[PDB]
Amino acid sequence: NLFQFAKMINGKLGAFSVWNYISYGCYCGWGGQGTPKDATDRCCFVHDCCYGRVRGCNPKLAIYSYSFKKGNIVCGKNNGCLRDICECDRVAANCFHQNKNTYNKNYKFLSSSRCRQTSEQC
Amino acid sequence: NLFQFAKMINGKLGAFSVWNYISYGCYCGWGGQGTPKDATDRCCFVHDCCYGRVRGCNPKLAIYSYSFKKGNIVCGKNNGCLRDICECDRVAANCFHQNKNTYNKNYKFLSSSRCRQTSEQC
Numbered sequence: 318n319l320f321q322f323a324k325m326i327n328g329k330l331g332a333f334s335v336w337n338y339i340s341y342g343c344y345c346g347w348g349g350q351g352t353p354k355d356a357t358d359r360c361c362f363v364h365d366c367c368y369g370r371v372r373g374c375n376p377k378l379a380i381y382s383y384s385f386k387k388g389n390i391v392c393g394k395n396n397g398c399l400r401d402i403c404e405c406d407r408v409a410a411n412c413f414h415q416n417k418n419t420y421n422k423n424y425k426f427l428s429s430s431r432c433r434q435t436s437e438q439c
Numbered sequence: 440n441l442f443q444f445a446k447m448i449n450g451k452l453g454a455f456s457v458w459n460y461i462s463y464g465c466y467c468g469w470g471g472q473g474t475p476k477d478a479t480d481r482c483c484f485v486h487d488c489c490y491g492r493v494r495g496c497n498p499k500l501a502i503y504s505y506s507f508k509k510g511n512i513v514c515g516k517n518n519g520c521l522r523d524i525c526e527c528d529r530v531a532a533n534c535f536h537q538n539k540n541t542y543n544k545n546y547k548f549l550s551s552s553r554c555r556q557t558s559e560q561c
């Protein structure tokens with residue numbers, strides 16, 4: 318769900334990383350507006366989209382099957398919206414590692430007026 | 440959207456308040472499994488359930504219209520799902536205020552093991 322995405326995060330992020338994703342960019346953690354200030358914060362957008370597209374079932378509450386073969390991410394059964402959900406997180410969690418180098422603390426807990434600009438479509 | 444939402448919490452339940460729903464209980468913050476704990480937790484959950492009902496929109500990424508009628512959150516003349524999403528965020532919000540003292544600091548942060556159970560139904 319999100320409890321997982323978290324562990325799914327920590328997993329490929331060395332435990333206590335989700336904390337750095339509590340409130341980032343215009344999309345990360347609490348957010349949803351203007352344009353993605355950062356690629357990492359863009360990782361977020363996706364995940365939001367990814368979920369946003371998901372047909373019918375609830376993610377915040379969706380409980381799925383996922384594993385970590387050799388410290389690496391792997392989603393279980395390839396059937397159901399769950400296939401989908403477990404995907405975002407995977408990717409997401411991953412997209413993270415993909416840009417952990419471009420992380421701007423100065424982008425932590427920003428303010429609305431930071432993203433007040435026009436939205437940006439998925 | 441979270442932001443919109445965020446504000447609400449800062450609004451009705453003072454500032455910095457948000458930071459206290461960042462994570463707490465099986466359903467507040469990052470979570471989504473097992474049964475709730477007390478009240479506050481329930482407050483969230485439903486929201487999630489509320490978010491759960493909705494369709495054709497993304498509560499994370501939606502952007503409704505709200506405002507405090509000088510003292511209490513109020514979702515103004517709507518046009519669709521926003522109508523809802525707002526309301527969702529709206530009450531869930533009021534919902535917290537409805538049970539402040541009941542807050543239990545030690546319920547903020549569970550190992551996702553404190554909930555290790557099956558998410559109930561909406």
Ligand SMILES: CCCCCCCC/C=C\CCCCCCCC(N)=O
Pocket residue numbers: 319338344345346347359360361362363364365409410412460461462466467468469482483484485486487488531
């Ligand atoms: C690729 C990055 C992923 C996008 C960012 C995901 C961050 C998750 C945000 C949601 C959890 C924050 C707490 C709000 C949830 C409280 C739920 C309740 N019903 O209000």
